[PDB]
């Protein structure tokens, strides 16, 4: 239900949302249509849910990291920038944002992490991670702490995980292998083992988050931290003489941060697509438009080539994308979304000490082959059950076995019940996309009884197929898209332990 005639933007909290508001005010002054900028909590997860229902902002700002999933699901609308504009941005930024050969969002700026130390406490930063303990101990004598950064978000801890080895998705002959995940190989093991050793050496605390570390460094408590461009403004106002440098080398190898590209995508459900285009091309991605949001909160290395000269007077940008030059651009494949969640859990699980390092990495790597497997299985079945014609696109062997077994068992239980499913669909009063969005509540209540079984989830998938059929009858059709995803999340969010325990979908097919 996006209103027509007014522009609504979503930008993460730790961004120059005041600068975005300023450019929006400029837009309103010129074009004469109201502009509103919001920073919803974890907007990267809010946007898909709301846009799936047809509501949401007319523009969504985020790293290219996950925009590929947005475009693949259809939430984003393909942009059509003239060749002249396509020349106005760095080619690698375009290649990063481009998905399936088509441009799905406008890159705003390329950013990567850096090691920011306090010159006052630490005259020279440690050139390698192995020196952190020593310095820590030294600074522990004077009551300070050497390094303190955000351990909650896997983005900040990843550069260390990827230093020695470790990779997200193995590239091969021009395409990824989503069945090949590098978050369980030796390099990631060593990196996260060093991190947990730092944690249990008292040099770090697990509960540290972004705000805690930022405040600590601003007050001058901690000598070093790890952060990206957006943080610098907070450092600047605290009057703590600071330097920013390449991340320490680990085991003789550089730490490779996942280079991100903050980019703006236009909502598919938005009737005001051209309005968003005017806001981005003509208004946002200009020298002054980007300069304002940078002065508010430095984005990092801007995508615009013209502004890069002004981007050069500041050594911090040089250090940041030096770290980037050590690192690689985040892939836009949709799996990446789930992947991040995966690593997130492991990062916490080992950091708190709940799970052993190798245990956490193995869990995070099974999350990559559990999430996408389940999403694919639900796909091509829910749509097949609704339309009635099996989709002929290729699956692997486990995928085909799961498809067949799900078909037979789910159709059988649908036939057996019939009246119960019909009455419950009536009792839910599913008429619009918001109803299927709220279907998450029954999703959680289904498993809330405290016991688990394959029968429960298979009956759930059958009910989902029935709901998709009736959505086709009531012509929602598009509601087939998120409902399937709605299942996947609750399967990976609340049932990951059982799914991994039962060998994933292999145990599912064996039990049926």
């Amino acid at each position: 239900k996006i209103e027509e005639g007014k522009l609504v933007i979503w930008i993460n909290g730790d961004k120059g949302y005041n600068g975005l508001a300023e450019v929006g005010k400029k837009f309103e002054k010129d074009t004469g249509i109201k502009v509103t900028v919001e920073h919803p909590d974890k907007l990267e997860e809010k946007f898909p849910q709301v846009a799936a229902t047809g509501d949401g902002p007319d523009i969504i700002f985020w790293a290219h990291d996950r925009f590929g999933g947005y475009a693949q699901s259809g939430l984003l609308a393909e942009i059509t920038p003239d060749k002249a504009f396509q020349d106005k941005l760095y080619p690698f930024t375009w290649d990063a944002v481009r998905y399936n050969g088509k441009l799905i969002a406008y890159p705003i700026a390329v950013e990567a992490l850096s090691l920011i130390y306090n010159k006052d406490l630490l005259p020279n930063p440690p050139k390698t991670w192995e020196e952190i303990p020593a310095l820590d101990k030294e600074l522990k004598a004077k009551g300070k702490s050497a390094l303190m950064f955000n351990l909650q978000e896997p983005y900040f801890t990843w550069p260390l995980i990827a230093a020695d080895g470790g990779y997200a998705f193995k590239y091969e002959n021009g395409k990824y292998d989503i069945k090949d995940v590098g978050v369980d190989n030796a390099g990631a093991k060593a990196g996260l083992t060093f991190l947990v050793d730092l944690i249990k050496n008292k040099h770090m605390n697990a509960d540290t988050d972004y705000s805690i570390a930022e405040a600590a460094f601003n007050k001058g408590e901690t000598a070093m931290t790890i952060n990206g461009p957006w943080a610098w403004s907070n450092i600047d106002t605290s009057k703590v003489n600071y330097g920013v440098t390449v991340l320490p080398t680990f085991k003789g190898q550089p730490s490779k941060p996942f280079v991100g590209v903050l980019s703006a995508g236009i909502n598919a459900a938005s009737p005001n697509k051209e309005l968003a285009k005017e806001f981005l091309e003509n208004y946002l991605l200009t020298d002054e438009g980007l300069e304002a949001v940078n002065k508010d909160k430095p984005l990092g290395a801007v995508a615009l080539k013209s502004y890069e000269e002004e981007l050069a007077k500041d050594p911090r940008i040089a250090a940041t994308m030096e770290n980037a030059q050590k690192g690689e651009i985040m892939p836009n494949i949709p799996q990446m979304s789930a992947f991040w969640y995966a690593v997130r859990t492991a990062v916490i699980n080992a950091a708190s000490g709940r799970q052993t390092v190798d245990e956490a990495l193995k869990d995070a790597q099974t999350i990559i082959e559990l999430y996408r497997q389940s999403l694919e299985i639900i796909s091509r079945y829910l749509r097949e059950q609704a339309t009635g014609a099996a989709d002929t696109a290729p699956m692997g062997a486990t995928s085909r076995k799961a498809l067949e077994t799900l078909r037979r068992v789910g159709d059988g239980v649908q036939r057996n019940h019939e009246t119960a499913f019909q009455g419950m669909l009536r009792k839910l009063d599913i008429k619009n996309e918001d109803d299927v969005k709220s279907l998450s509540r029954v999703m959680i209540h289904v498993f809330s009884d405290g016991v688990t079984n394959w029968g429960r989830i298979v009956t759930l998938i059958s009910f989902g197929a029935f709901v998709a059929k009736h959505l086709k009858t009531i012509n929602q059709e598009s509601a087939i898209e998120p409902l399937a995803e709605s299942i996947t999340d609750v399967l990976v969010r609340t049932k990951r332990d059982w799914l991994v325990k039962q060998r994933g979908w292999d145990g599912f097919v064996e039990f049926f």
Binding site: N416, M424, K427, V442, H445, V446, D449, V451, R456, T459
Partner: peptide, 21 residues
Amino acid sequence: STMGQVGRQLAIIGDDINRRY
């Protein structure tokens, strides 16, 4: 709420159909 009861009966029917299958 009655909806909690329909969820409970979801659980019951799932358990039953698993028992016979």
